[PDB]
Amino acid sequence: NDWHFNIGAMYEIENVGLAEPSVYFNAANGPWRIALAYYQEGPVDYKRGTWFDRPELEVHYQFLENDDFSFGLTGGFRNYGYHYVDEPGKDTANMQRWKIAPDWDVKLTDDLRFNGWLSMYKFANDLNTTGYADTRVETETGLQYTFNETVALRVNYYLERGFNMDDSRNNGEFSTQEIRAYLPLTLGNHSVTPYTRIGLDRWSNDFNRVGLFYGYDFQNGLSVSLEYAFEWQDHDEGDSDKFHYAGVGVNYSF
Ligand SMILES: CCCCCCCCO[C@@H]1O[C@H](CO)[C@@H](O)[C@H](O)[C@H]1O
Ligand SMILES: CCCCCCCCO[C@@H]1O[C@H](CO)[C@@H](O)[C@H](O)[C@H]1O
Ligand code: NA
Numbered sequence: 665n666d667w668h669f670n671i672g673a674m675y676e677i678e679n680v681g682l683a684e685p686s687v688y689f690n691a692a693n694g695p696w697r698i699a700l701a702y703y704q705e706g707p708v709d710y711k712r713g714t715w716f717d718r719p720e721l722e723v724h725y726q727f728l729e730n731d732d733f734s735f736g737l738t739g740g741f742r743n744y745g746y747h748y749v750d751e752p753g754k755d756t757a758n759m760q761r762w763k764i765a766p767d768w769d770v771k772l773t774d775d776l777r778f779n780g781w782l783s784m785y786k787f788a789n790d791l792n793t794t795g796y797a798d799t800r801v802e803t804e805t806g807l808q809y810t811f812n813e814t815v816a817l818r819v820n821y822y823l824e825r826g827f828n829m830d831d832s833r834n835n836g837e838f839s840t841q842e843i844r845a846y847l848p849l850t851l852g853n854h855s856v857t858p859y860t861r862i863g864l865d866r867w868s869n870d871f872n873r874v875g876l877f878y879g880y881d882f883q884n885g886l887s888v889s890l891e892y893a894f895e896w897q898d899h900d901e902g903d904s905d906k907f908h909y910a911g912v913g914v915n916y917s918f
Pocket of ligand 1: 673674675685687707709710
């Protein structure tokens, strides 16, 4: 068919300070895609602190792609390379995440679709050290109403659950449910998307978030992105838990 290629880098920053540099490569031919990515996560001013890296191979097979029913499958591997700093009883960890994840875009009407993805994960080595449950389910699924070429509405249900399949393990058990809404504006070469997540019910061992993605394509294979988001848990009279996300990214296609 045609080979398509993307390369890119992202820089994400999350404070209340974490620095998250990353780079990726993908190539596709017909229903086949291959994805290398390297992500790292650590405090700003590395006052050094503990950090990790996250190399990733993913493979996607497009089983069906048309207007009434598209359906798809992602298989993924990564390692988490934890580097502990001034934590007692920890030096390093190396935990791997295995992924299988179908993704589907089904047509309800001429301007209403049901789409989503569903990730089942297995998490491998150094679980006690790393604090993770050996199993995880994650999904964002919902409805896209298209107004027109310029305006659309995505409402989705979103679910993360961590559970050990071991009887003799309860480290890192947790559930998150949220409603997520986005209104993606496609203004020619601009892309403007405001969005919220409303926590329904979160527990681990409710919350809300507003944000704004912005995306320019320059018609030569280059594009860039800005994203900002504000999150809050809301607590004892006024003074609540408050977090900022920021993100810049670039991509090149060929
Ligand atoms: C994938 C490549 C991304 C390159 C972005 C580098 C952005 C700058 O990075 C900043 O440099 C500061 C010094 O001013 C450091 O203290 C911080 O760790 C960092 O936020
Ligand atoms: C697409 C890019 C793939 C890059 C794979 C990089 C190999 C990662 O390997 C890791 O290097 C880290 C950094 O010092 C350490 O956490 C570990 O010693 C090592 O496992
Ligand atoms: Na977004």
